[PDB]
Design a protein around this ligand. Sequence first.
Ligand SMILES: Nc1ncnc2c1ncn2[C@H]1CC[C@@H](COP(=O)(O)OP(=O)(O)OP(=O)(O)O)O1
Ligand SMILES: [Mg+2]
Ligand code: NA
Ligand code: NA
Ligand code: NA
Ligand code: NA
Length: 534
Amino acid sequence: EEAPWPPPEGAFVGFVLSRKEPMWADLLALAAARGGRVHRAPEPYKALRDLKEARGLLAKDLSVLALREGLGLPPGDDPMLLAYLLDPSNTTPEGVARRYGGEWTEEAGERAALSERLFANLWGRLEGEERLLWLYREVERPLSAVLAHMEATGVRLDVAYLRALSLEVAEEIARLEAEVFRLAGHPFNLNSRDQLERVLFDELGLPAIGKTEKTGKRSTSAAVLEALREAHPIVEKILQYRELTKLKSTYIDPLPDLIHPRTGRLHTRFNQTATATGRLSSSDPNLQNIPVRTPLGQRIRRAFIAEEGWLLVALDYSQIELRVLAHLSGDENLIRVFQEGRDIHTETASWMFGVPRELMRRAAKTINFGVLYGMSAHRLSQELAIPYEEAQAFIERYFQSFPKVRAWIEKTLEEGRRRGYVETLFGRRRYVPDLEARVKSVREAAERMAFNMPVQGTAADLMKLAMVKLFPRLEEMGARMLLQVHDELVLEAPKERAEAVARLAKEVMEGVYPLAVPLEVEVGIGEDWLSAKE
DNA sequence: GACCACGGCGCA
DNA sequence: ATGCGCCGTGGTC
Ligand SMILES: Nc1ncnc2c1ncn2[C@H]1CC[C@@H](COP(=O)(O)OP(=O)(O)OP(=O)(O)O)O1
Ligand SMILES: [Mg+2]
Ligand code: NA
Ligand code: NA
Ligand code: NA
Ligand code: NA
């Protein structure tokens, strides 16, 4: 079925890259398949100009590359998106191909023919599934195009700043290390958890708290060291060393080396079919886990800056998962809190009775989260420095204040056992087979994954939809969408329009989809990521 | 050179 | 006793 290039319109494209990252890859081959007929392009780059849309497996990748080359080529249909909506465990072409009667190879033609077959088989599986079809048409397909532009745009990084920070951090690392060696009486590789384990529990007299999952080594995790804070002066220094070496090795050092030559900016990949809940993920580099919670983290956030003459706009959905929970469960007390414009964490702790709003909120905050994950009392203790007794109680009072949440959890599990899957507000599905496992530990783990999904997944849907609606508006205002961090959006705007952009973006996000409770958005504007988050 | 399992930890 | 992706160590091929 070999015909000369070019191919008819609407043909499924197949491409081969020298590496997985579209912004860094050489385009090795380009082929298209239509009516079982395969066309292979003599010169991939030149041939790119003939396409008016990228339709096929991993379409966003080819689109990102086209944008890199100055071509306005939009991603279209992608069988990966259909498969992922059918079952979120469909995360790769290799896995998908197998499951649905194909073979993911390394040739552009075969890949183009794989795309065709796969789209047929998957689309047919989606007839009658009108809610998934809605997700595909109204969210995932348009979203892929938005993500393609975010990836091609990238974000500006202050390299000189990071270079200087690295040298300072290094100095502090050496001092902590030297001190650790002093307390240990001898040098050793502090980055080796095995060597550290012997030092702490064999050479020093320190008690071993917990063991590691796979190999049963005496754990040296932060949880363990924290609980060992005042059993010996050395552990305190090890925690500081760990924080500093984590951020230096993971962010401070690698990021400056990843700046693209043409753009002078940092380009991440927004993976659209990689999670079980419907969230995006970010990789190569991951810009969804840039530090922020510690002073040194905040200093790292400062490295992310606006282009000169522009500003960063950062928008954050307040407590979106709790709000989704209020809607899903219908809990009146919970809904009331939000509709009255109250702050749940300050309200939730108010039910340490006798205080409308005086007491630490980070406890009520720790609790609310613990509810989302199925956290047990024993965990609240370590995560609150509170005796096991006062933890188990804190949890019971919660389900008294918010009864319908428990009812919703129970109902979600029961339905999940029935149908074999649970679903988001919009109908996104996750299959959770182990709900009927006969080992309690396995069964209950499955239950936590099961009831968390509708909460995490609805919040993901709301944000995705918000991005879809917001993107066209930004273009008209001459603004850029840069990053998404699950419940946050980071935009780039010309200094003069930043304020106007902030108003608009905020409103679009808050109105994305009216629920039983309002969606509130914190918005900030600044020269860098740190100052943009108020 | 590439890849692996593990423990560990950054963010939502 | 939620969801990700990346790091160094210790290791194979
Ligand atoms: N330590 C932690 N453990 C688990 N999940 C966490 C977490 N920190 C954040 N998350 C996830 C779970 C939900 C989300 C919470 O985001 P915020 O941290 O900003 O807390 P918010 O609800 O906004 O309270 P406010 O900011 O008003 O004090 O991030
Ligand atoms: Mg917040
Ligand atoms: Na499955
Ligand atoms: Na990509
Ligand atoms: Na997955
Ligand atoms: Na990688």
